[PDB]
């Protein structure tokens, strides 16, 4: 028994759709520090025309900058952020902007796929695979927004 | 006659020569000397007759002769009802000001209010303004230089009357100085209210000077661009003139099509402005992207189709122009009006004329997402089109609330509606 704005968490994506979303997100893992460093060293050695890279967006400030621009297509939100005020308004912002959002249990689990110890949120803007993203978005909507 | 035959200043004559204009039109020849003498004037000069340059030349000459600094007044204020006409007038004036150090600017309704307010603090001496924004500007623009008023004129008095700005024009004139300032106005026709406004605004005795099947298609706001492209492709290599709301949209569409179609608008250089029209006329296969104001500049040559894509500046003006074309040519160019499903209310105006009627993407999305210049041009065209829709008089037929910005953006190739500061 808490205010409606609270307890919107504890209702989350089911195991199957959550696993599917994690599998889809793992494809766009950003180049870790070691991989980027070695690739840059290789490029410099070769020097001693380029496609736009694709990666997931996870910075809370960066994600919020992408959110409200309607560029973000799907956003994942951790339900165990200690400063809950950082994420209480994010679902409402996404709903107002019409951007589908999914609450996934575990900030550590969210961060494990972006080479970070923890990550409050994760969002996707570009895609490689658009049909898979659309199907995942539809499934997430039908299983989360229409239910809760 | 020629402008060089007068006592005009050397920089003004050089600017005129660089503009490509050497001969003086009847209205220009009649009005330039009396206006340079400082006498007021009123007339029924129709749009496109060259009255803009005829008025500008005496005003620019006065600015050059007085040499007053921008901090010593406001120079010339030119009120224009339509945003498109205001932009065309500003572009024409820029050609003369290219050889003049006096500051020039614009105050257009619907544009960024803060930008115009900040620009007004620099003492603009060549100002093109709109009646609607002037009330708020004078009510809130602290420190705006508004006392000198070297010259104040109005244009398209009939359109102002139709819009109903007379109530605002009265207050603007009352607040405006009532001194030796030269006063003039022009319109397509003279009526009781226009004459009353002239009497109220003209202090001295004026130096009076004087000089059908309709086709349309119903298409969604998103499919309009693709429908037009398909129609042009099926009818490619022909001679067709397309009327567009704004010059920026014309440039964007021409650039997109070129990436066999020419462009012609009031923002292009006057020399190129005339050269493009001449080339289109003499090509026998050219395609022209232009606006209503530029088309009104000269009589439309023989054409096969008149694809009025964007809404016309004045429905009455277009309705009369189609009839005039139907009588001045034998091979009448079929008209192709585009009506939004939510804009079907225009049918009443068409029926009032009693004329017969007839009822005749990823590839570019990727290019927009990959090219910065093309994306910027598309955004500018979308903004100009929305502003032109805002600057309309048939508020019962055309409404921004009736248009889905997402569909318009899709027509322009943007996945999402770009930002626009429309007063919705």
């Amino acid at each position: 028994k808490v205010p409606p704005t609270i307890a919107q968490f504890q209702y989350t994506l089911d195991r199957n759709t959550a696993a599917e979303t994690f599998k889809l997100f793992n494809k766009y893992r950003p180049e870790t520090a070691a991989e980027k460093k070695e690739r840059l060293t290789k490029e410099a050695a070769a020097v001693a025309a380029s496609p736009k890279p694709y990666a997931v967006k996870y910075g809370l400030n960066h994600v919020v900058a992408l959110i409200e621009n309607k560029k973000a297509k799907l956003v994942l939100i951790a339900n165990d952020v200690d400063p809950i005020e950082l994420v209480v308004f994010l679902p409402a912002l996404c709903k107002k902007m019409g951007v589908p959002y999914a609450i996934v249990k575990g900030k550590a689990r969210l961060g494990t796929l972006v080479n970070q110890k923890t990550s409050a949120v994760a969002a996707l803007t570009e895609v490689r695979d658009e049909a898979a993203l659309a199907k995942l978005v539809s499934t997430i909507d039908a299983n989360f927004a229409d239910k809760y | 006659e020629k402008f060089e035959e007068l006592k005009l200043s050397q920089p003004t004559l050089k600017a005129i020569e660089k503009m490509g204009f050497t001969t003086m039109t009847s209205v220009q020849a009649r009005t330039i000397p009396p206006l340079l003498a400082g006498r007021d004037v009123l007339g029924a000069a129709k749009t496109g007759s060259g009255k803009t340059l005829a008025f500008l030349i005496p005003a620019i000459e006065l600015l050059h002769s007085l040499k007053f600094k921008p901090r010593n007044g406001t120079g010339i204020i030119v009120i224009t009802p339509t945003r498109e006409l205001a932009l065309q007038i500003f572009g024409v004036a820029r050609e003369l000001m290219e050889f003049h150090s006096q500051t020039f600017g614009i105050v257009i309704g619907g544009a960024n209010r803060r930008q115009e307010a900040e620009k007004l603090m620099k003492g603009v001496n060549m100002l093109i303004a709109t009646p609607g924004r002037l009330l708020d500007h004078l009510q809130n623009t602290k420190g705006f230089v508004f006392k000198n008023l070297k010259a104040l004129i109005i244009d398209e008095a009939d359109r102002i009357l139709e819009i109903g700005f007379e109530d605002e024009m009265r207050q603007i004139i009352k607040i405006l100085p009532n001194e030796d300032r030269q006063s003039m106005l022009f319109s397509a026709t003279q009526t009781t209210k226009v004459e009353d406004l002239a009497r109220i605004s003209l202090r001295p005795g004026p130096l009076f000077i004087n000089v059908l099947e309709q086709g349309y298609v119903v298409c969604d706001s998103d499919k309009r661009f693709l429908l037009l492209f398909s129609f042009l492709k099926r009818n490619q290599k022909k001679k067709i003139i397309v009327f567009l709301s704004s010059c920026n949209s014309v440039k964007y569409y021409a650039e997109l099509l070129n990436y066999p179609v020419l462009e012609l608008h009031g923002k292009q250089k006057q020399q190129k402005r005339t050269n493009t029209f001449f080339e289109f006329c003499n090509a026998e296969r050219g395609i022209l992207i232009c606006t209503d104001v530029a088309a009104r500049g000269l009589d439309i040559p023989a054409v096969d189709w008149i694809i009025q894509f964007d809404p016309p500046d004045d429905p009455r003006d277009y309705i009369h122009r189609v009839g005039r074309t139907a009588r001045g040519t034998k091979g009448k160019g079929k008209s192709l009006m585009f009506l939004t499903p939510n804009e079907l209310g225009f049918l009443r105006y068409l029926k009032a004329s009693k004329v017969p009627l007839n009822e005749y993407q990823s590839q570019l999305e990727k290019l927009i997402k990959s090219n910065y210049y093309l994306h910027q041009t598309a955004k500018d065209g979308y903004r100009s089109y929305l502003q032109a829709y805002a600057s309309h008089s048939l508020k019962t037929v055309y409404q921004i609330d009736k248009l889905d910005l997402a569909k318009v953006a899709k027509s322009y190739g943007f996945p999402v509606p770009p930002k626009v500061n429309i007063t919705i």
Partner: protein, 46 residues
């Protein structure tokens, strides 16, 4: 409609300048002989 402003910077439609700066810094280091290319590191792994 989106609420934000400041239209898209050119860098978003152009390869990052930071990547070029890092590549040129690595090139300078290689010229100074203080960085061994990974291909040479593979040989030195012996």
């Amino acid at each position: 409609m989106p609420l934000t402003a400041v239209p898209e910077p050119k860098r978003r439609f152009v390869p990052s300048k930071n990547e070029a700066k890092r590549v040129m810094k690595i090139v300078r280091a290689i010229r100074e002989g203080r960085i061994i290319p990974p291909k040479k590191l593979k040989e030195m792994k012996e």
